[PDB]
Amino acid sequence: MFSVFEEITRIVVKEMDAGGDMIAVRSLVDADRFRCFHLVGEKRTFFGCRHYTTGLTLMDILDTKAEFQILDNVDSTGELIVRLPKEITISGSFQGFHHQKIKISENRISQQYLATLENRKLKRELPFSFRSINTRENLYLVTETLETVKEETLKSDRQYKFWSQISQGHLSYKHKGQREVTIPPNRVLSYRVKQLVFPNKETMNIHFRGKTKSFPE
Amino acid sequence: MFSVFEEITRIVVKEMDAGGDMIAVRSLVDADRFRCFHLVGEKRTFFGCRHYTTGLTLMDILDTKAEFQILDNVDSTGELIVRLPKEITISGSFQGFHHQKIKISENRISQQYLATLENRKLKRELPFSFRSINTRENLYLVTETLETVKEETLKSDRQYKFWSQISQGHLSYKHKGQREVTIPPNRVLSYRVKQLVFPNKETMNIHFRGKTKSFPE
Amino acid sequence: MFSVFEEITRIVVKEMDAGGDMIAVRSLVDADRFRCFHLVGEKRTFFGCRHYTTGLTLMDILDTKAEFQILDNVDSTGELIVRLPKEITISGSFQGFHHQKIKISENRISQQYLATLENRKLKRELPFSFRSINTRENLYLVTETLETVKEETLKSDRQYKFWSQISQGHLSYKHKGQREVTIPPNRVLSYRVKQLVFPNKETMNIHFRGKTKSFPE
Amino acid sequence: MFSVFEEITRIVVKEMDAGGDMIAVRSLVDADRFRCFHLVGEKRTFFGCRHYTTGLTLMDILDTKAEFQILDNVDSTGELIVRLPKEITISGSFQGFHHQKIKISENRISQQYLATLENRKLKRELPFSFRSINTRENLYLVTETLETVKEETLKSDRQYKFWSQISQGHLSYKHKGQREVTIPPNRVLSYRVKQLVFPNKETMNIHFRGKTKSFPE
Structure with missing residues (x-):
């Protein structure tokens, strides 16, 4: 495997929100678009x-x-060994060393706003970006976000050493890779969503609880 | 597994309230919302x-x-070993080292207020946030809270070393992880609740004792 | 297991009142409410x-x-060992090291007051906090209290080392935990009670001796 | 295998966009044309x-x-060995050592523009460059780009040592090559695209989601 940013977001979600509903941003190219x-x-x-x-x-x-x-x-x-009566003896080791230090901050839209944003009419200027959205899938609004506030530098190191002997020959592969990435501030590390169901083109019906269809029109 | 904040809240609940009714806040993202x-x-x-x-x-x-x-x-x-007549010998060790130092403070709504907040009429401005709450589930008011007053830095260290030999091959996994988290002040570590039953839309009937239904309407 | 405050209250009750009737406060969150x-x-x-x-x-x-x-x-x-003909040999050790230093003070309502508080009429402003109290259970007034007067710092250290061999495999668990807690002044460590029976809504009948029903109405 | 620029673009795509849709620029001669x-x-x-x-x-x-x-x-x-009953014993090792340090920046066309660039009429001055484009294939607009901002110097080192003994003779080959490349600023390392379907010669119909044909005319 995963991006370094993927690993740090998984750690931040596992820590800052035990259980709950927050999901971790996967790619930092579109982190700014999860604000x-x-x-x-x-x-x-x-x-x-x-x-x-x-x-x-x-x-x-x-x-x-x-x-x-x-x-x-x-x-x-993690090291595993497998043997087969066809003279196939495989053995693989997979190790990892991660080091991260990050300083995140939380932002969230106040429940007063969500109280105001109830069953609002949309804009008559329907953008083709939204107008062409497939109604089969859903649509959500990002509510809360954990975003960094400092330039970070995360490090990882993976090792995959696995081989396998066959009745005729062998096959081995050893990979050792140290990786390091840098991150600017304000990169959204995690977010949570509130659904938006649209019975028609003027109903921004904000759905809080309940698995339903976001386009019943 | 659990978040570091989860562990510190479990410790604080086990200590500051033996038995009783206080429950520990799980995630610190929504700790501020348990005030x-x-x-x-x-x-x-x-x-x-x-x-x-x-x-x-x-x-x-x-x-x-x-x-x-x-x-x-x-x-x-904790170390366990299991053997099976199918040539399956497993053995697993799970160790943990935790270090915490925290300074919490208690706040609580005075019983005078709960005396005043009896069978109150709600606001005519029913928010969709509340109006759409499923009546099958209950509803409570947070009464007392234990909240930190100082920036804390909690540390943990887990180790999972477990393997298993099978009739054909083996499989092992060794994990060692040191973790450390920081916490701002005023993070609610635990809370207790008093129910609110609503026979109608103008009855904030505050329920102290008794397992009942919070929406009989 | 027990809270550190639970242990110190048990010690204070066992010492400051041999036999008698004083019961030890369990949780220090509601210690202030046992005044x-x-x-x-x-x-x-x-x-x-x-x-x-x-x-x-x-x-x-x-x-x-x-x-x-x-x-x-x-x-x-304490160390115990058990053997069974089913090839089950268990052995468990449980050790504890406690250190406490506390300075408590005694307060109590004078018997003149209890003489005055006999068969009093209650307040016409029946709070729902009391009005809804289940008459099946009893009701008491806290009479005497042992409360700290200094900021205390109590220490404990527990160790649970127990294992068990079975006919197939084994299972062991070793726990070592050092714990330390701090306490502000005026935390009630123990209390004793005098019953209050209510034949009607204007009878605060203060009961000194005798196991009876506190709500005969 | 691959060009050094190919490797660095593959790394940048695997990191800066986990999953997603970004594709890595292959050749840096036409990197400037992927802007x-x-x-x-x-x-x-x-x-x-x-x-x-x-x-x-x-x-x-x-x-x-x-x-x-x-x-x-x-x-x-990675080392592999193969044996055959025809007295053919081959063995090959392939190793690689890569070192890269790069500082990229992100640019992207605002969704306001894509909102404006909907179903636009083209220029009446149809260039033969576009007029002769085969309608069987598709056509896209580059939306977002990761481009370097500093003169980079990337290094690689490959080794291919593989031989094979036959029933009559042998055959071996050993290659060791250290390679190093330099890159000017503003070289696009990756990009993502939005389709452009043309039902006629005046319809720049910008397609966001959906695998379709970009020339239905």
Whole structure:
């Protein structure tokens, strides 16, 4: 495997929100597009479901703090051996060494706003960006975000040493890679969403609780 | 596994309230939303029941100290071995080293207020945040809270070393992780609740004792 | 297991009142609510009976020194071994090291007051806090209290080392935990109660001796 | 295998965009032609599909930040051995040592522009560069780009040592090559695209989501 930013976001989600609903930003290219008020969409896969960013803030379709310093190091190792009566003896070791130090901050839209943003009419200037959104999938508004406030420098180091002897020959592979990445401030590390169901083109019906369809029209 | 904040809240609940009714805040992202007067809801699971924060203070639906310094270190270790006639010999060790030093303070709503907040009429401005709350689940008001007053820095260190030999091959995994987190002041570490049953839309019937239904309407 | 405050209260009750009737405060979050004049209620369990604090002082339902310095250290250890014909050999050791130094003071309501508080009429402003009290359980008034007068710092250290070999495999667990807590002044460490039976809504009948029902109405 | 620039672009895509849709620029000769607003075309192959740059910016057919410092080193090695009953024993080792340090920046066309660039009429001055584009293939607009901002110097080192004994004779080959390349600023390392479907010669229909045909005319 995963990006360094992926690992740091997974750690931040596992720590700053035990259970709950916060999901970790995957890619930092579109981290800026997961900021508060940015509309988000869902997509279904055979593995599961994921989120994408349309790049639309709420103002496009609207008619119109807390600082946590995480720091950790991780050392993991896993070795397996398999044997088969076909003279196939495989053995693989996978080790990892991670070091991260990050200082995140929390932002969130006040519940007063969500109280005001109830069943609002959209803009008559329907953008093709939104007008063409497939109604089969859902649509959400980003509510709360954990974003860095300092230039970070995260480090990882992976090692994959695995081989396998066959009845005829062998095959081995040894990889050792040290990786290091740098991050500017204000990169959203995690977010949570509130659904937006649209019975028609003037109903920004903000859905808080309940698995439902975001486009019943 | 658990968040560091989860562990420190579990320790604070086990110490500052032997037995009793106080429950420990799980995630520190929504710790600020478990402050006093913040409405809370229940949710049932196959494992049990848990609480969530609506983010509503009492003023939304209303018509209208003691300082404890805890410090501890924990060293635990557990090793198990299992054998099976199918040539399956597994063995796993799980160790943990925790160090915490925290200074919490207590706040609570005076019983005079709870005397005044009896069978109050709500606000005619029913927010969709509350209006859409599922009546199947319950609703509570946060009464007392233990909140930090100093920037804390908690440390943990886990180790999972477990392997298993099979009739054909083996499989091992060794993980060693040191973790450290920082916490700002005023983070609610634990809370207790008093129910609010609503026979109708103007009855904020505050329930002190008794397992009942919070929405008989 | 027990809270450190639980252990210190058990020691203070075992020392400052041999036999007698004083019961030890369990949780220090509601220690302040066990102060003198605070009404208390009973609750029955399959294990036995316990007390809770309503948070009501007598003034709510009324119409209208001695300093002991305890210091001790305790070192206990218990080791047991069990064998079974099913190839089950278990062995467990449980050790504890406690160190406490505390300076408590005694307060108590004079028997002149209890002489005056006989068969008093309550307040016509029946609070729902009291009005809804289940008449099946009892109701008491806190009479005497042992409360600290100095900021204390109590220490404990537990060790649980127990394992068990089975016919197939083994299972072991070793825990070592050092714990330390701090306490502000005026924390009630123990209390004793005098019952209040209510034949009607204007009879604060103060019961001194005799196991009876506190709500015959 | 691959060009050094190919390797650094693959690393930047794997890191700065986990999953997602960003594709890595392959050749740095035409990196400048993958800049924002530059039209791009697709081409299908038996292996898969790839992109080429027409060299056309949007202004040709229109009528009319974030800085990440990546640094890593990679050490990989793979050794295989094969035996055959025809007295053929081959063995090959392939090792690599990469060192890269790069500072990229992100640029992207604002969603306001994509809102404005909807179903635009093209220029009446149809260039033969575009007029002759085969309608079987697709056509896209480059939306976001990761481009270096500093003169970089990337290093690699490959080793291929493989031999094979046959029933009659042998055959061996050993190659060791250290390579180093330099890069000027503003070289686009990765890009993502938004399709442009043309039902006729005056319809710049900008397609966001959906695998379709970019020339239905």
